[PDB]
Amino acid sequence: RIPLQIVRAETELSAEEKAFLNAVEKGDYATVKQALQEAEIYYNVNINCMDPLGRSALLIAIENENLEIMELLLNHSVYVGDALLYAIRKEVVGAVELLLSYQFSEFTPDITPIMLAAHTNNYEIIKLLVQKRVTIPRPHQIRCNCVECVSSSEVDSLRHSRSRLNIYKALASPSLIALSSEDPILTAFRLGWELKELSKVENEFKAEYEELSQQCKLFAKDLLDQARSSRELEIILNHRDDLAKLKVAIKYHQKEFVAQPNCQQLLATLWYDGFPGWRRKHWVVKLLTCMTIGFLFPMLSIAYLISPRSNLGLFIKKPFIKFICHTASYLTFLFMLLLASQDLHVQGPPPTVVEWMILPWVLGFIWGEIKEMWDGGFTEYIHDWWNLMDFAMNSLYLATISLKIVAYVKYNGSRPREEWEMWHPTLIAEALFAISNILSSLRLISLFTANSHLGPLQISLGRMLLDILKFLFIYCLVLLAFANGLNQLYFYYETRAIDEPNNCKGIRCEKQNNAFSTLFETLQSLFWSVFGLLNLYVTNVKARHEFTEFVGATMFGTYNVISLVVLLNMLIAMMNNSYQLIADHADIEWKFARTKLWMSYFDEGGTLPPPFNIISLIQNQHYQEVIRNLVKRYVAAMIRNSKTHEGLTEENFKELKQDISSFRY
Amino acid sequence: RIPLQIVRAETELSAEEKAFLNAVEKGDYATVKQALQEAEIYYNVNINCMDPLGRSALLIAIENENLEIMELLLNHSVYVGDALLYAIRKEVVGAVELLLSYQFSEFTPDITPIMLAAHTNNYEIIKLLVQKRVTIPRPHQIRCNCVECVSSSEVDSLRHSRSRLNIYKALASPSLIALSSEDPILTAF
Amino acid sequence: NLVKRYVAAMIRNSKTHEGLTEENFKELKQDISSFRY
Ligand SMILES: CC(C)CCC[C@@H](C)[C@H]1CC[C@H]2[C@@H]3CC=C4C[C@@H](OC(=O)CCC(=O)O)CC[C@]4(C)[C@H]3CC[C@]12C
Ligand SMILES: [Ca+2]
Ligand SMILES: [Zn+2]
Ligand SMILES: [Zn+2]
């Protein structure tokens, strides 16, 4: 039999001090007033009593929303501590104003009235509080090591983290940004960037910072949405302190802001400068004009080089024409590379005509690469992740040219490749040239972002590469373990290449042998076993060691099972789970990428294609006026969205009943 | 210490012109009438004042849905601009009829009362508006290259696109197809 | 202390819903009717 009792006992009640609490709970004004005045005359009661549910007279008045009992209690000199915070958090303007005009608490001691107003995001009460000179502390830099920060973290770290989070949550309020801010858009950009940076540093508190950054981005997008004229749109997008604001938004990774329909329409208008009917055109005529502009790229380049100011001179300044010319030049370079492969008995031959034509394009590519790193900088150069492939290709081409010139200078004989050594400079140069051709042909993937059908697909594939890289580590660990074991088992029976039928050793021969004799060969065999290109008799020895053969076969079968049946199927499940979430924002990511690609062609520098490449207060006032108009529209819209819900409004009957009762009285 | 202040400051208030706004907000008919007549006799108040939340006397009457204060304010010769649109968009038939019988705006300048009625898709108010001879502009063919279309797109393209979208959204209303159409099925197709 | 805070928070979460509270008009109507009587 479980003796149910009270373990933590509170104080007793049911005196006159509880009588007048329950009178206030009833709320009848006359009875409350008479009981309170009688108790005050008697001078034997207090006002510190607490109900079992955790509410007092003032808290119950807060919950019931009765201004008459509110003013009566406040004029009766009841306790006032935290009552302003409770009223602000209850979100009633009349009692907030009344309390402003004049133990156990569910409020953190660091909470300020302005902080709570910012947390609750109420425009009216926020303005009412901010009309007085109220301020907010500064949280220190992200990696501050100053004595004040180290000391405060040492005395109490949980309170410090909570205070920082509360300060940032109050600062990231859309209303508190609408007021007391000269540039709300820039403020939102910087705040979102700072919160995104803070999320990584504060590992335990990540979701809160991420949601604050998302809220800032959404506020910026909603503020942009209210523009209702092309003049206002261009003023906003061109304000600086062209398209400086758009460049800043691209830098700060504001994909929702960038992918706005109005901004995209303006960008398309700027992009299709030469053609004004490109929107209303047939696919056949678009294709025909595409070839007819791409075919005359050398003529256009020569015309611009000769006469920069002419009818044909300025025809290449348009971004679309420049993009078409660059694409045609790259396609011509790739065609030359393909034609190159279509006497081989000389040692270090002079370059042929195809290589002579290929060299100016390669030199131009390198020149264009260095200028962009000099103009952009190291961080911008490495952020693209395509410049890595560009640098690798250019370095490989430079090494190929150097090796070819070295071979030409050194060797001058005529000997067969069957007698040439394995480390010949000519052979090294051909291998590097083949790798360079592979990389250059693979470089064409970056042009898929300009298309409507392939951009999101390419963006989705790029996102999944990360999961591929993550699984590669586990696969490599398993492969290393099994290769170590197999080599340790099989390294005893190594045989020389002379004893083999065709003087061939390894797995790249018809007589596959010595598959696990060395660690490198074991790694190669275990890699090739995934695709089923390794035979089954490689796990055999010339001697009759049936136990050893069976153990090796068991190891091989276990590795095959683990690699193919379990790990490969698990990768597939991860790809599906990742792509399900990836497919949601494909449009936004593709539009951001296409905007970056489009703006990459707006600059005046580098107009020519690679082969020929080698050879101020009025604006502030206008922006302020437009920002004021947008803020007013946004405030109205968000007030309405707050009014969209709770459609079953009340107290209209109470107000009318009070009025008619007074008239009857 | 972050100095919180006001960056964009509006006009001041709390005069008799704000007194009678908050009287209208209270909505007591006798008090509103006596205050309004006293202010009219004094001849020192206006009716153009705006609350901090973006509402006026007529807008608050729209939101509160009080026909008596509505007719009192309208017979007191308050400003009437856009009030018909606000009433139609609030979707109250009594005040829509009363307003039909007789700055900062959250409505696009191209919005027409019939267009807003079609957007909101209210059969009764749509019929009440369409009983009068009201019409709708034609958007041009899909690939129109005519001078009027090219010129209007050149002066302002965002407004042109918005106007086209609003016209088509008004035209694609199921109620506006049920009325004023001989073959609703073919029209919908 | 933790129990008190948790009880307050869960009472509030119970009060978070049913925001369209009633019987306030009934109590006021009963009071004014008695005063009129
Ligand atoms: C996977 C292939 C290439 C074989 C490599 C074998 C070892 C060199 C690897 C396999 C697992 C690795 C470990 C995996 C994870 C960790 C935890 C890691 O912990 C942290 O990074 C702690 C700090 C933090 O992340 O907050 C430190 C390295 C260590 C021990 C790694 C050390 C290197 C190990 C032993
Ligand atoms: Ca590049
Ligand atoms: Zn510090
Ligand atoms: Zn036209």
Side-chain angles (χ1 to χ4, degrees), chain A residues 1-644 647, chain B, chain C residues 1-16 19:
Chain A
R1 201 80 196 146
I2 290 123
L4 287 204
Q5 40 210 3
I6 282 46
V7 277
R8 288 155 284 271
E10 309 278 344
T11 61
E12 309 300 322
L13 262 190
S14 279
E16 32 193 344
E17 326 169 328
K18 186 51 174 299
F20 97 98
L21 278 283
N22 50 80
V24 170
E25 298 166 2
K26 296 155 195 298
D28 41 10
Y29 183 85
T31 305
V32 166
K33 167 183 51 59
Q34 69 196 4
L36 247 185
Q37 68 204 10
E38 166 189 358
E40 282 163 340
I41 294 306
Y42 281 23
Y43 275 115
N44 60 342
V45 315
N46 70 336
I47 50 100
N48 289 337
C49 282
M50 294 300 293
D51 89 321
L53 295 167
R55 297 198 252 139
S56 79
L58 223 42
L59 268 64
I60 288 156
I62 294 169
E63 183 178 2
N64 275 37
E65 184 41 46
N66 191 260
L67 278 150
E68 318 252 28
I69 208 56
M70 261 276 179
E71 53 91 16
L72 177 67
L73 278 184
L74 261 170
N75 286 55
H76 262 263
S77 298
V78 299
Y79 200 32
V80 74
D82 274 11
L84 183 54
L85 288 144
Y86 282 78
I88 290 179
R89 207 295 279 281
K90 187 46 185 55
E91 288 307 18
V92 316
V93 160
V96 157
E97 161 38 19
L98 213 169
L99 256 164
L100 253 181
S101 62
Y102 308 113
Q103 299 203 354
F104 157 68
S105 34
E106 41 189 7
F107 280 136
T108 313
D110 48 43
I111 295 282
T112 312
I114 177 68
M115 264 190 32
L116 192 46
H119 289 10
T120 50
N121 200 26
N122 210 223
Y123 190 83
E124 197 38 75
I125 307 196
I126 272 173
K127 183 177 32 93
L128 205 159
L129 263 298
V130 86
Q131 83 84 19
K132 285 146 197 171
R133 314 279 85 109
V134 195
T135 64
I136 280 196
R138 237 86 72 191
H140 284 204
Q141 62 121 338
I142 180 45
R143 301 183 161 89
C144 202
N145 295 148
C146 86
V147 47
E148 177 190 1
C149 285
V150 175
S151 176
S152 47
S153 64
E154 189 68 29
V155 278
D156 203 329
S157 201
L158 206 146
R159 192 164 297 267
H160 192 79
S161 305
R162 215 202 291 129
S163 300
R164 288 186 51 92
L165 187 50
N166 281 33
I167 285 288
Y168 269 104
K169 167 172 188 44
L171 269 184
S173 174
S175 171
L176 202 53
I177 294 179
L179 305 109
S180 76
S181 178
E182 305 279 359
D183 209 346
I185 293 180
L186 202 62
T187 298
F189 288 175
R190 302 200 262 90
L191 217 36
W193 183 257
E194 205 167 320
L195 292 164
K196 177 57 65 174
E197 294 278 349
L198 256 163
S199 84
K200 308 179 187 306
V201 177
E202 309 286 335
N203 302 296
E204 289 81 17
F205 310 89
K206 262 184 56 153
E208 287 130 341
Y209 284 112
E210 285 184 353
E211 94 203 329
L212 289 171
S213 197
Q214 294 300 320
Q215 142 184 336
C216 288
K217 297 194 183 69
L218 202 39
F219 167 61
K221 172 202 171 302
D222 289 354
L223 211 63
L224 175 74
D225 265 9
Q226 306 299 325
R228 64 172 54 168
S229 88
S230 293
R231 221 190 44 98
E232 297 175 359
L233 185 74
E234 51 196 11
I235 281 176
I236 292 156
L237 291 195
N238 277 313
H239 175 63
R240 102 186 327 165
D241 50 355
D242 293 348
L243 309 176
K245 201 139 291 286
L246 202 54
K247 290 161 183 173
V248 169
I250 283 186
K251 168 177 82 150
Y252 275 141
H253 295 72
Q254 306 279 306
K255 306 162 180 291
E256 291 105 290
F257 183 91
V258 164
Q260 229 271 321
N262 307 141
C263 169
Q264 287 303 315
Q265 190 217 318
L266 175 61
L267 282 167
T269 280
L270 281 182
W271 174 260
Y272 294 120
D273 189 30
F275 325 79
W278 187 270
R279 196 69 69 94
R280 320 147 298 210
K281 264 185 175 192
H282 214 296
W283 169 81
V284 280
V285 66
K286 282 175 190 178
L287 195 74
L288 275 66
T289 192
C290 281
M291 295 45 153
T292 201
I293 176 49
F295 256 111
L296 320 153
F297 91 85
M299 338 288 165
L300 260 64
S301 308
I302 277 304
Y304 172 89
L305 200 41
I306 293 183
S307 46
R309 256 75 53 99
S310 72
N311 258 320
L312 254 205
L314 55 97
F315 208 78
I316 199 192
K317 248 79 163 302
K318 312 165 181 300
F320 195 51
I321 312 292
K322 201 184 313 180
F323 168 76
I324 295 296
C325 281
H326 283 228
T327 301
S329 161
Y330 205 60
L331 286 181
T332 306
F333 171 68
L334 283 193
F335 179 80
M336 215 90 60
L337 277 189
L338 182 131
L339 219 65
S341 72
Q342 322 294 327
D343 194 81
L344 313 172
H345 275 22
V346 175
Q347 225 152 23
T352 75
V353 296
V354 194
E355 283 144 80
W356 276 125
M357 321 178 174
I358 283 169
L359 186 59
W361 242 288
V362 167
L363 293 177
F365 282 142
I366 298 171
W367 177 235
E369 278 296 308
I370 51 195
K371 292 170 94 287
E372 101 202 13
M373 74 93 189
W374 160 248
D375 290 345
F378 181 71
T379 62
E380 181 173 341
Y381 187 80
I382 66 178
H383 184 76
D384 194 21
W385 297 120
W386 288 97
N387 294 333
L388 258 298
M389 156 159 23
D390 294 23
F391 175 78
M393 169 191 353
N394 291 133
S395 279
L396 278 168
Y397 273 132
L398 225 59
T400 298
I401 295 157
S402 148
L403 260 304
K404 184 172 279 90
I405 294 169
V406 157
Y408 180 79
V409 165
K410 256 43 172 211
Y411 290 96
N412 54 339
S414 293
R415 237 161 48 187
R417 326 174 78 96
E418 61 101 9
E419 212 260 359
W420 292 351
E421 302 89 28
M422 104 158 60
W423 291 113
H424 213 263
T426 321
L427 312 181
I428 297 185
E430 316 172 338
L432 298 182
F433 199 49
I435 300 168
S436 276
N437 289 12
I438 286 186
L439 282 178
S440 301
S441 277
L442 271 189
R443 187 60 166 93
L444 266 193
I445 304 275
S446 75
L447 296 193
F448 279 165
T449 85
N451 211 257
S452 314
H453 315 280
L454 311 164
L457 214 81
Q458 179 196 355
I459 303 301
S460 299
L461 302 204
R463 293 300 204 92
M464 283 186 280
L465 289 208
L466 275 66
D467 304 6
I468 295 294
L469 259 283
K470 280 164 58 178
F471 218 86
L472 251 51
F473 250 83
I474 305 203
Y475 175 72
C476 271
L477 185 39
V478 166
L479 190 139
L480 198 297
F482 273 95
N484 191 333
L486 270 165
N487 174 40
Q488 181 96 41
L489 173 85
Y490 266 113
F491 91 103
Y492 287 126
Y493 312 97
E494 182 158 7
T495 54
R496 290 101 31 91
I498 330 168
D499 289 345
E500 322 289 61
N502 207 20
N503 206 103
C504 203
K505 216 177 113 169
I507 62 177
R508 297 195 314 262
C509 325
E510 262 148 6
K511 204 43 188 65
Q512 286 188 339
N513 47 73
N514 290 247
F516 319 110
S517 265
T518 59
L519 192 54
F520 206 40
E521 196 77 48
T522 324
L523 298 168
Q524 296 188 21
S525 295
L526 288 198
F527 168 76
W528 284 116
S529 275
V530 177
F531 313 112
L533 295 175
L534 203 76
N535 293 347
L536 196 44
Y537 53 82
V538 298
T539 70
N540 234 21
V541 175
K542 224 198 299 313
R544 275 319 97 167
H545 298 143
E546 301 207 8
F547 180 63
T548 286
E549 294 165 12
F550 189 81
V551 172
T554 305
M555 290 181 197
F556 190 39
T558 310
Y559 168 77
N560 265 341
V561 163
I562 291 186
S563 71
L564 261 43
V565 176
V566 185
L567 290 186
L568 193 59
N569 293 352
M570 282 174 173
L571 180 61
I572 288 176
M574 283 178 4
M575 307 268 239
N576 302 34
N577 170 277
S578 177
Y579 188 79
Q580 294 300 320
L581 320 177
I582 276 178
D584 281 15
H585 327 123
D587 286 279
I588 297 298
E589 295 302 320
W590 166 60
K591 276 186 176 186
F592 194 62
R594 195 185 61 172
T595 297
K596 262 151 71 63
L597 186 122
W598 282 6
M599 293 231 318
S600 178
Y601 281 104
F602 282 176
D603 52 14
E604 313 316 87
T607 314
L608 285 172
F612 311 92
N613 182 217
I614 175 181
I615 294 169
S616 193
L617 210 83
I618 299 333
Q619 177 202 59
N620 201 11
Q621 293 177 335
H622 283 45
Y623 180 78
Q624 286 301 319
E625 296 286 324
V626 175
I627 191 66
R628 162 204 317 273
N629 282 340
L630 290 203
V631 160
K632 283 217 60 177
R633 297 165 189 169
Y634 173 90
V635 164
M638 229 47 54
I639 284 178
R640 157 168 282 75
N641 274 265
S642 163
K643 281 309 289 175
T644 306
Chain B
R1 201 80 196 146
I2 290 123
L4 287 204
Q5 40 210 3
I6 282 46
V7 277
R8 288 155 284 271
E10 309 278 344
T11 61
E12 309 300 322
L13 262 190
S14 279
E16 32 193 344
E17 326 169 328
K18 186 51 174 299
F20 97 98
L21 278 283
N22 50 80
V24 170
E25 298 166 2
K26 296 155 195 298
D28 41 10
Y29 183 85
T31 305
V32 166
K33 167 183 51 59
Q34 69 196 4
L36 247 185
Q37 68 204 10
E38 166 189 358
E40 282 163 340
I41 294 306
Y42 281 23
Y43 275 115
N44 60 342
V45 315
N46 70 336
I47 50 100
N48 289 337
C49 282
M50 294 300 293
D51 89 321
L53 295 167
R55 297 198 252 139
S56 79
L58 223 42
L59 268 64
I60 288 156
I62 294 169
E63 183 178 2
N64 275 37
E65 184 41 46
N66 191 260
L67 278 150
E68 318 252 28
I69 208 56
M70 261 276 179
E71 53 91 16
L72 177 67
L73 278 184
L74 261 170
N75 286 55
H76 262 263
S77 298
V78 299
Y79 200 32
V80 74
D82 274 11
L84 183 54
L85 288 144
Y86 282 78
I88 290 179
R89 207 295 279 281
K90 187 46 185 55
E91 288 307 18
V92 316
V93 160
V96 157
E97 161 38 19
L98 213 169
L99 256 164
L100 253 181
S101 62
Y102 308 113
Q103 299 203 354
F104 157 68
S105 34
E106 41 189 7
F107 280 136
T108 313
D110 48 43
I111 295 282
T112 312
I114 177 68
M115 264 190 32
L116 192 46
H119 289 10
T120 50
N121 200 26
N122 210 223
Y123 190 83
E124 197 38 75
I125 307 196
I126 272 173
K127 183 177 32 93
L128 205 159
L129 263 298
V130 86
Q131 83 84 19
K132 285 146 197 171
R133 314 279 85 109
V134 195
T135 64
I136 280 196
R138 237 86 72 191
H140 284 204
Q141 62 121 338
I142 180 45
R143 301 183 161 89
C144 202
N145 295 148
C146 86
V147 47
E148 177 190 1
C149 285
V150 175
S151 176
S152 47
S153 64
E154 189 68 29
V155 278
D156 203 329
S157 200
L158 206 146
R159 192 164 297 267
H160 192 79
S161 305
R162 215 202 291 129
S163 300
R164 288 186 51 92
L165 187 50
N166 281 33
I167 285 288
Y168 269 104
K169 167 172 188 44
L171 269 184
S173 174
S175 171
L176 202 53
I177 294 179
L179 305 109
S180 76
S181 178
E182 305 279 359
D183 210 346
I185 293 180
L186 202 62
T187 298
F189 288 175
Chain C
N1 282 340
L2 290 203
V3 160
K4 283 217 60 177
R5 297 165 189 169
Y6 173 90
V7 164
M10 229 47 54
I11 284 178
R12 157 168 282 75
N13 274 265
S14 163
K15 281 309 289 175
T16 306

